[PDB]
C-alpha cells in the first residue's frame, strides 16, 4: 500500500495516510487551518476553528453580532447597485452562526438575493441544528428551512447550487421597508 | 357633493351608480361582471358569469383534475419537458374552488423560472377570507410561500410580472423533484 502526506503537513501534521483514511482524517486534523469565512472581503487570515469568531469580532467590525435563537437580520440599503454582501453573526446554544445575504447576477442580467446560514463548526456539529429564514410582510411570507452549512463547505458553493433561500429583487421590495429588508432568523436544536 | 359614476358593468345589466370611492369594491363583487376563461395555455374565448366558471372548467377543459381537501399535493408531471409551460389543477375546500397554477417562463432571458400561484374562483372580497401556503419539501429542506389567493378576475400575468407568488427555477426544482415530477404541497386555511 502507498501512503500520502496529510493536506496539512506544511502546518505540522506528520501523518502519512492511505486512500481509505485520508479524507476522514483531514476533516478532523488538529493542524487544519480555516480561511476567514466572511464573503466579499479580501482577508488572508488563517486559523484554527475555535479562533474564527474572535477574528470576526476584532477585524470585521462591520459585521453586527446579535445574541439569541430568534433574531431580526436587518439588511440596510438593498437598492445599492451591483454585487453586495450583508453579513451578521448570531450567537446561540454555545455556537456561532454566520448569516449571509448576497445580491448578485448568478444568471446573466438577473440580479437576485441569496440568503443562507452557516455554522462556525464542522459538518457533524451542523447536523445538530436547523434554521428558518422568514421574510414577513403585508399579508405575505416567504420561508426557507434547512440545516446550516458548515464552514467546511462555505457560502459560495451553496449559492451556486441554489441550496439556500433565493428571491427576486421584486420579492425583496414586497418585504422591504425604508429601503431595508428585515429577515427573521430562528435557530433550532 | 361627492362624484358618483355608473358601474363598469352597466352594459351587461348593472343599474347601480356608485360613489367613486366605492366603485372598485362594488365592481369586484358585481353579479353582472363578465369573467373570461381562467385556464392557462388555452386559446379559449369563453365568457360568462362567476357562477358558470367552475362548470366551464369541468366540462370544457376535461384535462383539468381536481383534488379535495384543504391540504393536498399538486403533482406537476414532466416539469422539464421543453415547450411545457403550464400545469393547472383545482382544489375544492371550504365550499369553494381554487385554481392552482404552475407556469414555466423565461422572464429574464436565459433563466427559466417557475411561478406557482393560487387563485380563487371568486372575488377579491371572497379571496381575502383565505390564506394559501405552497411548500416544496425535500431532504431536510423546505421552501414556503404564503399569501392571499388572487381572484381569477385579476389573472396570473400580473402576479408573475411582479413575482407575487412562489418563484423558483430549474436548479431549485431539481433539489425538490421526484423523477422529473414536482410535488407542491398546497394548504388553504380560513
Ligand atoms: Cl453580480
Ligand atoms: Cl376575468
Ligand atoms: Cl382540456
Ligand atoms: Zn493531518
Ligand atoms: Zn477575516
Ligand atoms: Zn355593478
Ligand atoms: Zn375555457
Curated annotation (Swiss-Prot), chain B:
Gene Ontology BP, a term: negative regulation of canonical Wnt signaling pathway
Region described as SBD: 1-190
Catalysed reaction equations from the record: S-ubiquitinyl-[E2 ubiquitin-conjugating enzyme]-L-cysteine + [acceptor protein]-L-lysine = [E2 ubiquitin-conjugating enzyme]-L-cysteine + N(6)-ubiquitinyl-[acceptor protein]-L-lysine
Main localization, broad class: cytoplasm
Main EC class the enzyme belongs to: transferase
Binding-site list for Zn(2+) 1: 7, 14, 26, 30
Key words, A-Z: Apoptosis, Biological rhythms, Cell cycle, Cytoplasm, Metal-binding, Nucleus, Phosphoprotein, Transferase, Ubl conjugation pathway, Zinc, Zinc-finger
EC numbers for this chain: 2.3.2.27
This protein's GO CC annotations: cytoplasm; cytosol; early endosome; intracellular membrane-bounded organelle; neuronal cell body; nucleoplasm
Zinc fingers (SIAH-type), renumbered ranges: 2-62
Regulation acting on activity, per entry: Inhibited by interaction with SNCAIP (isoform 2, but not isoform 1). May be inhibited by interaction with PEG10.
Subcellular location: Cytoplasm; Nucleus
Binding residues annotated for Zn(2+) 2, in chain numbering: 37, 44, 56, 61
MF GO annotations: transcription corepressor activity; ubiquitin conjugating enzyme binding; ubiquitin protein ligase activity; ubiquitin-protein transferase activity; zinc ion binding
Pathway as given in its UniProt record: Protein modification; protein ubiquitination
Tissue occurrence: Widely expressed at low level.
Oligomer and partners: Homodimer. Interacts with UBE2E2. Interacts with PEG3. Interacts with VAV1, without mediating its ubiquitin-mediated degradation. Interacts with CACYBP/SIP. Probable component of some large E3 complex possibly composed of UBE2D1, SIAH2, CACYBP/SIP, SKP1, APC and TBL1X. Interacts with PEG10, which may inhibit its activity. Interacts with EGLN2 and SNCAIP. Interacts with DYRK2. Interacts with NR1D1 and NR1D2. Interacts with DCC. Interacts with AXIN1.
Job of this protein: E3 ubiquitin-protein ligase that mediates ubiquitination and subsequent proteasomal degradation of target proteins. E3 ubiquitin ligases accept ubiquitin from an E2 ubiquitin-conjugating enzyme in the form of a thioester and then directly transfers the ubiquitin to targeted substrates. Mediates E3 ubiquitin ligase activity either through direct binding to substrates or by functioning as the essential RING domain subunit of larger E3 complexes.
Family listed: Belongs to the SINA (Seven in absentia) family.
Free-text domain note: The RING-type zinc finger domain is essential for ubiquitin ligase activity.
Protein name, as recorded: E3 ubiquitin-protein ligase SIAH2
Organism of provenance: Homo sapiens
Chain's gene name: SIAH2
Amino acid at each position: 500500500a502507498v501512503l500520502f502526506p496529510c493536506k496539512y503537513a506544511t502546518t505540522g501534521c506528520s501523518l502519512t495516510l492511505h486512500h481509505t483514511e485520508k479524507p476522514e482524517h483531514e476533516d478532523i486534523c488538529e493542524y487544519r487551518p480555516y480561511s476567514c469565512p466572511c464573503p466579499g472581503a479580501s482577508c488572508k487570515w488563517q486559523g484554527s476553528l475555535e479562533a474564527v469568531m474572535s477574528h470576526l469580532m476584532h477585524a470585521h467590525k462591520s459585521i453586527t453580532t446579535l445574541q439569541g435563537e430568534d433574531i431580526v437580520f436587518l439588511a440596510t440599503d438593498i437598492n445599492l447597485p451591483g454585487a453586495v454582501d450583508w453579513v451578521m453573526m448570531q450567537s446561540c446554544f454555545g455556537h456561532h452562526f454566520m448569516l449571509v445575504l448576497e445580491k448578485q447576477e448568478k444568471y446573466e442580467g438577473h440580479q437576485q438575493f441569496f440568503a443562507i446560514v452557516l455554522l462556525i463548526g464542522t459538518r457533524k456539529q451542523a447536523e445538530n441544528f436547523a434554521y428558518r429564514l422568514e421574510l414577513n410582510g403585508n399579508r405575505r411570507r416567504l420561508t426557507w428551512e434547512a440545516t446550516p452549512r458548515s464552514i467546511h463547505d462555505g457560502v459560495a458553493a451553496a449559492i451556486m447550487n441554489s441550496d439556500c433561500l433565493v428571491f427576486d429583487t421584486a420579492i425583496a421590495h414586497l418585504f422591504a421597508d425604508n429601503g431595508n429588508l428585515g429577515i427573521n432568523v430562528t435557530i433550532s436544536t
